[PDB]
Design an enzyme around this catalytic site. Structure first.
Site, PDB file in Angstrom:
ATOM      1  N   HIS A 278       9.503  -5.631   7.677  1.00 35.06           N
ATOM      2  CA  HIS A 278       9.444  -6.259   6.496  1.00 35.06           C
ATOM      3  C   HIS A 278       9.161  -5.227   5.436  1.00 35.06           C
ATOM      4  O   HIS A 278       8.050  -5.091   5.189  1.00 35.06           O
ATOM      5  CB  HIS A 278       8.751  -7.312   6.379  1.00 35.06           C
ATOM      6  CG  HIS A 278       8.499  -8.038   5.031  1.00 35.06           C
ATOM      7  ND1 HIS A 278       9.230  -8.709   4.495  1.00 35.06           N
ATOM      8  CD2 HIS A 278       7.095  -8.145   4.422  1.00 35.06           C
ATOM      9  CE1 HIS A 278       8.998  -9.098   3.204  1.00 35.06           C
ATOM     10  NE2 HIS A 278       7.816  -9.019   3.101  1.00 35.06           N
TER      11      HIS A 278
ATOM     12  N   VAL B 224       2.079 -12.956   7.120  1.00 30.84           N
ATOM     13  CA  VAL B 224       2.600 -13.056   6.026  1.00 30.84           C
ATOM     14  C   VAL B 224       2.045 -11.705   4.949  1.00 30.84           C
ATOM     15  O   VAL B 224       2.972 -11.151   4.536  1.00 30.84           O
ATOM     16  CB  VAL B 224       2.420 -14.317   4.864  1.00 30.84           C
ATOM     17  CG1 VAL B 224       3.272 -14.283   3.628  1.00 30.84           C
ATOM     18  CG2 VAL B 224       3.217 -15.417   5.892  1.00 30.84           C
TER      19      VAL B 224
ATOM     20  N   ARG C  42      -0.938  -3.873  -3.228  1.00 31.97           N
ATOM     21  CA  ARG C  42      -0.932  -2.546  -3.586  1.00 31.97           C
ATOM     22  C   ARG C  42      -1.424  -2.642  -5.013  1.00 31.97           C
ATOM     23  O   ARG C  42      -0.671  -3.362  -5.954  1.00 31.97           O
ATOM     24  CB  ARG C  42       0.568  -1.929  -3.264  1.00 31.97           C
ATOM     25  CG  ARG C  42       0.432  -0.431  -3.482  1.00 31.97           C
ATOM     26  CD  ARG C  42       1.892   0.110  -3.385  1.00 31.97           C
ATOM     27  NE  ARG C  42       1.926   1.533  -3.640  1.00 31.97           N
ATOM     28  CZ  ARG C  42       2.334   2.344  -2.526  1.00 31.97           C
ATOM     29  NH1 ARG C  42       2.581   1.743  -1.258  1.00 31.97           N
ATOM     30  NH2 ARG C  42       2.419   3.461  -2.738  1.00 31.97           N
TER      31      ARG C  42
ATOM     32  N   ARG D 118       0.599   4.231   0.669  1.00 31.14           N
ATOM     33  CA  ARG D 118       0.821   3.242   1.839  1.00 31.14           C
ATOM     34  C   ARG D 118      -0.026   3.526   3.094  1.00 31.14           C
ATOM     35  O   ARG D 118      -0.472   2.328   3.558  1.00 31.14           O
ATOM     36  CB  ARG D 118       2.295   3.858   2.469  1.00 31.14           C
ATOM     37  CG  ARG D 118       2.985   2.930   3.507  1.00 31.14           C
ATOM     38  CD  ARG D 118       3.387   1.321   3.154  1.00 31.14           C
ATOM     39  NE  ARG D 118       4.052   0.730   3.980  1.00 31.14           N
ATOM     40  CZ  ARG D 118       4.253  -0.514   3.637  1.00 31.14           C
ATOM     41  NH1 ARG D 118       3.711  -1.303   3.000  1.00 31.14           N
ATOM     42  NH2 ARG D 118       5.012  -1.077   4.825  1.00 31.14           N
TER      43      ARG D 118
ATOM     44  N   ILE E 295       0.568 -17.803  -3.292  1.00 35.48           N
ATOM     45  CA  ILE E 295       1.399 -18.303  -2.331  1.00 35.48           C
ATOM     46  C   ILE E 295       0.817 -19.662  -1.748  1.00 35.48           C
ATOM     47  O   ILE E 295       1.338 -20.454  -1.290  1.00 35.48           O
ATOM     48  CB  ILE E 295       1.456 -17.148  -1.284  1.00 35.48           C
ATOM     49  CG1 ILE E 295       2.561 -16.095  -2.055  1.00 35.48           C
ATOM     50  CG2 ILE E 295       2.302 -17.728   0.004  1.00 35.48           C
ATOM     51  CD1 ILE E 295       2.443 -14.767  -0.952  1.00 35.48           C
TER      52      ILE E 295
ATOM     53  N   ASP F 110      13.177 -12.369   3.584  1.00 37.67           N
ATOM     54  CA  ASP F 110      14.166 -11.362   3.453  1.00 37.67           C
ATOM     55  C   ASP F 110      15.679 -12.092   3.964  1.00 37.67           C
ATOM     56  O   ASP F 110      16.592 -11.540   3.323  1.00 37.67           O
ATOM     57  CB  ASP F 110      13.988 -10.116   4.482  1.00 37.67           C
ATOM     58  CG  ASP F 110      12.612  -9.371   4.062  1.00 37.67           C
ATOM     59  OD1 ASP F 110      12.516  -8.949   2.850  1.00 37.67           O
ATOM     60  OD2 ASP F 110      11.772  -9.330   4.953  1.00 37.67           O
TER      61      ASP F 110
END
Lengths: 327, 327
Positions: free
Chosen positions: B185, B127, B90, B96, B14, B157
């Protein structure tokens, strides 16, 4: 004002770094709509569809159509620009002639698809290596496309040289103007630090370090791609994509006063360059026409570097001619 | 007319797709000079120096300084924007809870470093996932920074939802306006196809397929990241970078008449969202100030989706509080 653009090797790292900036308006301008025709080899088409999903997920106002295909004729159908990014890198056991032979086959076909399917106004911008000779081969296989439509990219070399000069002189990047890379996009390129300017004055005279310019600056520019690979751990894709954006932009917008840019193009004989070779020259775009900057001068050092790179381009031409790649 | 920006995770995919577009002027505008403070983990520093070499080889007129470091405090020193991209993804075996825990510890330290080293006017744009709760944690560890300086990104999204609506309705992307992603998100996000508009009319009235809207459309947006990964092979790095460009731009430029944008921000109680939660709201920037769009309505279907994503964010907050991450 809508431009249809083919991009080959579109799922590779350069293409992935390139297509989003194109769709954002940076190549052709903020009011020019774009249609992206993306070409890949068959095994890479699924990845390409992922790239297309990402383009859609940017909600670009200027992006009006996306085509993803492995069919070269479909990719070239009615395109106004063909960005020939994809090529074959050197692999285990290849000889130099083998690399020219493999890429020659590819660019023969891409030239002929451009000839038979692209828009009448098409321009061709070759990036994949060896880009000068790949461009020569494509140009020679597009009999119906005028020869002044064919370009190859030395813009990355030029921008790298511009930063090296600005760093050494401790000036802002915008104080460097008229940076010329003569000849081949290769290790024999001649980054001309005499005719480049820093604050309007010959860079050689401003920097005043003949040793550094001849022994560090030239080799640093020639070897910069290898240095990025060593540092980053993969190819210099984002800066290559930037250089594509910048070089095509140079061909579609008039050059500000005081500037010029490097571009490979078919030689008409300027500077003694064998007519028909693809060779990097200093250029300006004036009133919408591309012109070679004439009357730049060399010293003996420069004539030596100039002839070395001219002779390399002659040798490559003679080699692919010998392989039957020029008809 | 100069902004200093920290980018964490700057050598990742990114960051690599993001920093060149920032340097080209697309985040803060064509007349705004930029200083890039790039942060990485120590093992990734060599690769980050390669990214900086590539930035330099772009000869960007607006890029006035590059800092490469693994020192978090150095990275945040005097920055005006902190783009908190880096995070632990992840991986196999993680729940989670583990994702919230591992990244929570990182954002405690990042918030505290922004608090103690960043400029007085700093704004924070989160982000890296889970971005809403990572933002909450950073905000809670920056006692001296006003809470209205903290943002997290639902822009990707939102742009994904805009393109799905335009594609289904057969309209250009610019025909879609006021796309709101409510809440987290995450897969509980509510992409509101009633308040979104197509040529000025509720999308739910233009697209008459109620089942498509409630099942296909909402799920496609919620699962789009997974679908890109399946298709490309890697994450949606370039479209995420585009969303960061677009989201920060939404926060520094006034919103055109008739539009709105999704932004996670600290709730003051709007729409019944618990004070202090980071929650995605419809927003406009008017005369330089961010304002929540109020009085938007819901039907019973939308109320349930809204409550589901609110309760998920409450659950995440309670989890990291239970972990001791809010002190």
């Amino acid at each position: 004002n809508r431009v249809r653009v083919a991009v080959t090797g579109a799922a590779g790292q350069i293409g992935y770094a390139l297509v989003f900036r194109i769709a954002s308006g940076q190549m052709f301008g903020p009011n020019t709509e774009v249609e992206l025709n993306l070409l890949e080899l068959e095994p890479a088409l699924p990845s390409l569809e992922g790239v297309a999903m990402e383009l859609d997920d940017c909600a670009f106002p200027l992006l009006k159509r996306i085509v993803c295909t492995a069919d070269l004729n479909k990719a070239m159908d009615g395109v106004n620009w063909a960005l020939l990014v994809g090529s074959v890198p050197r692999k285990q056991g290849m000889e130099r002639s083998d690399l020219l032979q493999i890429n020659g086959g590819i660019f023969t076909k891409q030239g002929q698809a451009i000839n038979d399917y692209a828009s009448d106004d098409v321009r061709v911008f070759v990036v994949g290596n060896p880009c000068n000779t790949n461009c020569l081969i494509a140009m020679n296989h597009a009999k119906d496309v005028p020869s002044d439509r064919f370009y190859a990219m030395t813009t990355l070399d030029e921008l790298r040289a511009r930063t090296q000069l600005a760093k050494k002189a401790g000036v802002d990047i915008t104080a460097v103007t008229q940076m010329t890379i003569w000849g081949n996009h290769s290790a024999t390129q001649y980054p001309d630090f005499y005719n480049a300017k820093i604050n309007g004055t010959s860079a050689a005279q401003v920097i005043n370090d003949e040793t550094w310019l001849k022994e560090t600056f030239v080799s640093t520019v020639q070897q910069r791609g290898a240095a990025v690979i060593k540092a980053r751990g993969s190819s210099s894709a984002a800066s290559a994509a930037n250089a594509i954006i910048t070089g095509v932009n140079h061909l579609v917008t008039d050059t500000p006063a005081g500037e010029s840019f490097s571009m490979c193009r078919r030689s008409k004989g300027e500077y003694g360059v064998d007519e028909g070779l693809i060779f990097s020259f200093p250029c300006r775009r004036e009133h919408g026409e591309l012109k070679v900057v004439e009357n730049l001068e060399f010293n003996d050092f420069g004539r030596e570097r100039f002839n070395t790179t001219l002779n390399e381009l002659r040798s490559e031409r003679d080699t692919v001619k010998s392989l039957g790649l020029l008809d």
